[PDB]
Amino acid sequence: DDIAFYEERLRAAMLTGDLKGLETLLADDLAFVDHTGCVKTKQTHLEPYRAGLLKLSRLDLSDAVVRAAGEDGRVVVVRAVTAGVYDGEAFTETLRFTRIWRRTQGPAGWKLVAGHCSVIL
Amino acid sequence: DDIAFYEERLRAAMLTGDLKGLETLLADDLAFVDHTGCVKTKQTHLEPYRAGLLKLSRLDLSDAVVRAAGEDGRVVVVRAVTAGVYDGEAFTETLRFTRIWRRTQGPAGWKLVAGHCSVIL
């Protein structure tokens, strides 16, 4: 019902490095565009978390816009102020995220089918 | 049914500056993230076309990925090689586009509810 629950779950899993949490939230057909415009799969997307190459210290979301793409699709567009370490280097980055969630059944929930992030300039 | 029809319609409307075509394809609740991470509405998104401030000469799409966000949502992630004039200046830009289409009824079709574009680096 409320995509805020899943958005918050995702934020927590990313911030805490909860790989199992991330694996649960992301659909296996994930197509995720990264900040260089490269299209990543679920396994390539989660690799930095799984290797310990990405650790986030800050992930502050604001200005969320939510739209419906039918009863079973939800778009979330949000501003994210982030900091952490990536590939051995401290970083700070401010991004716009677009995320597309699909409704899932069996266990009633939502999973992430696609997303895009790019820097806010 | 085939989101390729609407993707191709959109490509043609953008390339030809068909403002009415664009107005038909874009939902009124459009949230579109531009290449600086700014979130635009349908009216702010179409303004450069309507003013004659953006004219495209090239819009070559490739490597399209399509995903379903239920029966009534479709995600398209595509590489776009573009050129034109914007605000009086010739430009060339290569982008990744993410587009989220919703199924519409009455006239059976699809309209764009959200999107994101960023440069491929």
Side-chain angles (χ1 to χ4, degrees), chain B residues 52-75:
Chain B
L53 278 172
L54 175 62
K55 189 69 198 60
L56 291 180
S57 73
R58 179 176 181 186
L59 184 56
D60 294 333
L61 307 187
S62 66
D63 297 339
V65 169
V66 183
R67 295 294 183 266
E71 219 171 272
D72 291 348
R74 292 287 178 275
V75 189

Side-chain angles (χ1 to χ4, degrees), chain B residues 26-104 106-115:
Chain B
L26 272 37
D28 291 331
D29 58 342
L30 182 73
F32 200 95
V33 181
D34 77 11
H35 65 179
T36 64
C38 189
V39 187
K40 303 283 184 204
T41 63
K42 182 181 180 174
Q43 288 311 307
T44 64
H45 190 68
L46 298 186
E47 186 53 28
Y49 292 101
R50 183 180 294 130
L53 278 172
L54 175 62
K55 189 69 198 60
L56 291 180
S57 73
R58 179 176 181 186
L59 184 56
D60 294 333
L61 307 187
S62 66
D63 297 339
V65 169
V66 183
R67 295 294 183 266
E71 219 171 272
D72 291 348
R74 292 287 178 275
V75 189
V76 176
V77 173
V78 64
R79 173 181 176 101
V81 173
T82 87
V85 183
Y86 182 56
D87 298 335
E89 296 183 299
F91 76 88
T92 48
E93 189 176 25
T94 298
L95 302 125
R96 193 79 62 181
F97 282 84
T98 302
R99 270 186 289 265
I100 306 82
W101 300 84
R102 69 146 64 91
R103 184 186 300 276
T104 54
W110 295 80
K111 294 189 185 215
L112 191 65
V113 60

Side-chain angles (χ1 to χ4, degrees), chain A residues 72-104 106-119:
Chain A
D72 291 348
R74 292 287 178 275
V75 189
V76 176
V77 173
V78 64
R79 173 181 176 101
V81 173
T82 87
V85 183
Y86 182 56
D87 298 335
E89 296 183 299
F91 76 88
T92 48
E93 189 176 25
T94 298
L95 302 125
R96 193 79 62 181
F97 282 84
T98 302
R99 270 186 289 265
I100 306 82
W101 300 84
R102 69 146 64 91
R103 184 186 300 276
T104 54
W110 295 80
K111 294 189 185 215
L112 191 65
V113 60
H116 196 139
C117 73
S118 67
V119 297

Side-chain angles (χ1 to χ4, degrees), chain A residues 2 12-13 24 28 52 61 71-72 74 88 90 109 116:
Chain A
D2 199 340
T24 300
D28 291 331
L61 307 187
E71 219 171 272
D72 291 348
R74 292 287 178 275
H116 196 139

Side-chain angles (χ1 to χ4, degrees), chain A residues 15 24 28 43 49 66 70 97:
Chain A
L15 198 36
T24 300
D28 291 331
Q43 288 311 307
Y49 292 101
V66 183
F97 282 84

